[PDB]
Amino acid sequence: EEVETFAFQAEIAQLMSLIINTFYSNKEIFLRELISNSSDALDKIRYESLTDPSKLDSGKELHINLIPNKQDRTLTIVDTGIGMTKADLINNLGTIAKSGTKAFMEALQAGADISMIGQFGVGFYSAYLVAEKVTVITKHNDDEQYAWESSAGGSFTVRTDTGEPMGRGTKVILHLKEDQTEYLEERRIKEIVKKHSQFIGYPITLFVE
């Protein structure tokens, strides 16, 4: 398969290095960030449904699924949101994050906490607090299925997903660090969801193993 490799923009690469090497025990914030991104993707496609009703022909249900898998050591966050095009993954996410990183890093020096990352539109990268590798499968109405991947280290890869079609939405697969397996435990996910995502306007299903 034709795998394309891209360098992260200097600011994002730096933010990712900050997230990976900074001593910070309150790692559970990653979940709230990912669910908050999923809720936004669901708001975007729910808004599109009003003007044009044909955009829902790739799945009518607007929901969030939390899928732990102890065998694979993965925590998957699935949404039936707007999804991303190839341009979204390469250019659009790169430029929105470029401005976000600068705003957040200046705020960190001005008294802000790492838990305030989401206010800068870079909440996604908090995934690297618990994950050694992140794989993103995405499908937008105006494009094909793409798989994005990064183990940080300054690069990401993009390829056309030859795997299982998902219709529309985004699947964030967190390949958890060795010492971060508590995020595969039902009671731990439940407690995090109740504490930080108690008022999300879409159903959140926690899968059992």
Ligand X SMILES: CNCc1ccccc1-c1ccc2nc(N)nc(C(=O)N3Cc4ccccc4C3)c2c1
Q: Kindly state whether residue 204 participates in binding ligand X, applying the rule CB under 6 A.
A: no
41 sits near ligand X (criterion: CB under 6 A): yes
Instruction: Render the burial of 33-52: b for 16+ CB within 10 Å, e for the rest.
Output: bbbbbbbebbeebbeeeeee
> Closer CB to ligand X, residue 66 or residue 82?
82
Per CB under 6 A, 28 contacts ligand X? no
Strands (DSSP E) found in 8-83: 64-69, 74-79
Is 65 marked as a binding-site residue? Answer: no
Token digits of residue 185: 């435990």
**Nearest distance from residue 92's CB to ligand X, in Å?**
4
Q: Please check if 124 is assigned to a binding site.
A: yes
- Strand blocks (E) in the chain: 4-7, 64-69, 74-79, 131-139, 146-150, 155-160, 169-176, 204-206
Q: Which of the residues 101 through 160 are near ligand X (CB under 6 A)?
A: 124, 136, 148
Please state the closest distance from residue 127 (CB atom) to ligand X, in A: 9
CB of 111 to ligand X, least distance (A): 25
The answer to whether residue 37 forms part of the interface with ligand X (CB under 6 A) is: yes
18 CB neighbour count, 10 Å cutoff: 17
Q: Does 182 bind ligand X (CB under 6 A)?
A: no
d(CA 68, CA 98): 31
Q: How many angstroms separate the CA atoms of 92 and 23, rounded? A: 30
- Among positions 49-108, residues that touch ligand X (CB under 6 A) are 79, 81-84, 88, 92-93
Binding annotation: 37, 79, 98, 124
Q: Which residues sit at the interface with ligand X, rule CB under 6 A?
A: 37-38, 40-41, 44, 79, 81-84, 88, 92-93, 124, 136, 148, 170
Binding annotation for ATP: 37, 79, 98, 124
